[PDB]
Write a protein that binds this ligand. Structure first.
Ligand code: ZN
Length: 56
RNA sequence: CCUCCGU
């Protein structure tokens, strides 16, 4: 079963104004009520991009 | 994916 599981948080980004960033606002779509972590605009998952290295 | 800088 699933009990223990690590967490991979890759921080990145920083080019916008926190116009009175509401503690109950969304820092994604700018919607008030839901959090970015719960942004209904976010893409479905699991489905993340891959780096896929190949020469260079 | 894009706008998750707030964990
Ligand atoms: Zn949102």
């Amino acid at each position: 079963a699933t009990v223990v599981s690590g967490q991979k948080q890759d921080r990145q980004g920083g080019e916008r104004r926190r116009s009175q960033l509401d503690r109950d606002q969304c820092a994604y779509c700018k919607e008030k009520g839901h959090w970015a972590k719960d942004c209904p605009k976010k893409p479905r998952g699991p489905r993340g991009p891959r780096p896929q290295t190949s020469l260079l």
